[PDB]
Amino acid sequence: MQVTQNPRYLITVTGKKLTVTCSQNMNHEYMSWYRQDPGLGLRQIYYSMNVEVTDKGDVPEGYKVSRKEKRNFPLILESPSPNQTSLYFCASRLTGRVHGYTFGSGTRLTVVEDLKNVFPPEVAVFEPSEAEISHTQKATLVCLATGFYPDHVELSWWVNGKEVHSGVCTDPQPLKEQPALNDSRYALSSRLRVSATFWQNPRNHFRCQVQFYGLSENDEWTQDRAKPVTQIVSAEAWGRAD
Amino acid sequence: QLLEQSPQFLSIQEGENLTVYCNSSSVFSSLQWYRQEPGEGPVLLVTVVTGGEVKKLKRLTFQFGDARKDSSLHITAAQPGDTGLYLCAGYGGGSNYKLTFGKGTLLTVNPYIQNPDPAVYQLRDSKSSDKSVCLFTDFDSQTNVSQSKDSDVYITDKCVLDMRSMDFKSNSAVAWSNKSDFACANAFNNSIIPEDTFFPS
Ligand SMILES: [Cl-]
C-alpha cells in the first residue's frame, strides 16, 4: 500500500503559484489533503470522493484541488501565504465507512515571506567531559545545529566514516531560537555516547552531519552572504589522548 | 465536527497498562484510530462502526460505546516502541463525507533505567573552548526536564539513547546560552532533580 507524496521538503517564496502532488495506484476512490500544525492537530483541507468529485474540508481557504484522474490528487496554492507553512499529508481510502486511510509520508512546506529569511545551519561538536569519563566510563558527544531556517534538516552521526544509530538520540523536533518571531531560525541537538576508551583513541573520528534542504538554481538570490542552497554542513572531532 | 481526545499528553513507565479516550458530540458513520511517529504518515490501527464493539489487536484493545459516540484505546504492558501520537478520526455522520481528526494523545513510554546516576557535565566546543553546552544525563525515567524562564537559555527535552553493544540506555537533556551567569551548576534549576545529582567542579 503506497501513497506517494513528493517532494518531502519544499520552500517557495510567498505569492508564487505552487502545486503539491499526490499519487496512489491502489484504485482508491477517496483522497484527501490534511495539514498538520503545532497546537492545531491534523485539519482536513479538501477531499475527493471520486474522479471529478471534490469537496471542501474545514480549512479550504487559499487552496484548490482537482481530480481529473483517479490516481492523482494535486493541491494547488495559487498565491501561497506564510500562514500556509505546514506539514502536508495526502491520504487515500476506499469509500465505505469501514475503510481507513493509507497516508503519504508528508511534504514539509515553508512559504517564506522573503528569501533573505533562509539560512543554512551552523554545526558544532562539543567534546565529552573528563568528569563524565571518570564517573561513568562513558563519553557523550553533543552536536548542536543552530541558526537554520526553514526547519528542513536531517541530522546523522558518522564514526570512522560509517553511519551510526546505536548510542544516538536526536531531539524529536528543533526548537525556535527567537520564539516570538514568525520567521524564527531553529536549533537542534543530538547526542552520541561511546565508551571512554573509544573516545580516548586518537584514531577514531566523529562527525555530526546536518543535511539542510534549501534553495536551488530556480531561486533568485540577492543577498551579500552565500546562497542558502540545499547542502550538508558537518562538524567533526578526533578522539583525544590527552 | 470536533473530536476530543484525552489526555492530550501521557508519559507512561514501561510495563504499565494505560487507556486513552476519544469523545465527540457528533454522531459519526465510523471512528478510526491511527498511530503516528513524528513527521511520518499516520498508520491505521482500526476502524469501529458498530455501537458497542470491542476489537483486540494484540496488546491493544479498542472499544466503541453502545451509543456510538465514545471510543477508548487500551494498551497492556506498554513498551517504548508504543511511543507515538494516537489519533482518533470521525468519518461521515449523514450530512457530509469529511474525515475529521482529534488532536491525539501524545504517548511517551519511558524505558526502565536499571542504574541511574544523575549528573550535569560541561562540554566544550571542539573548535572553540569559550563555547560550551551543559549535559544533564543518566537520570531516571520519571525525571521531568523543564524549560528555562530565561529566553537566553535553550534547554532540550529529554532523549533516550541505547548503547546496544553494552545493553545500556540513558536519558539526557542539553542546555546552552551566551550569558555570563550561565554555569552548568544552575542550567537545569527550573527542573526538580535529585538531591544526589552529581555536579563535578
Ligand atoms: Cl457511546
Residue numbers in the entry:
A (entry chain B): 0 to 241
B (entry chain A): 1 to 201
Task: Reproduce, without paraphrasing, sentences from the article in which this PDB structure was first reported.
Here we describe a mechanism by which an HLA-B*0702-specific acute myeloid leukemia phosphoneoantigen, pMLL747–755 (EPR(pS)PSHSM), is recognized by a cognate T cell receptor named TCR27, a candidate for cancer immunotherapy. Here we describe the crystal structures for TCR27 and for HLA-B*0702 in complex with pMLL747–755 or similar peptides. Our data show that non-covalent interactions between the epitope phosphate group and TCR27 are crucial for TCR specificity.
The cognate TCR for pMLL747–755, named TCR27, was identified from CD8+ pMLL747–755-activated T cells from a healthy donor, and it contains the TRAV27 and TRBV27 variable gene segments. The crystal structure of TCR27 ectodomain was determined by the X-ray crystallography. The quaternary conformation of TCR_1 was different from that of TCR_2, with an RMSD value between protein atoms of the two structures of 3.1Å (with both CDR3 loops excluded from alignment), which indicated the existence of conformational heterogeneity in TCR27. The residue-by-residue CA difference plots between the Vα and Vβ aligned protein domains demonstrated that the tertiary structures for both domains were similar in TCR_1 and TCR_2 despite a significant difference between their quaternary conformations. It is evident that the quaternary “transition” between TCR_1 and TCR_2 is mainly the result of the rigid-body rotation of one TCR subunit with respect to another one. TCR27 adopts at least two quaternary conformations. Both structures were used to generate docking models.
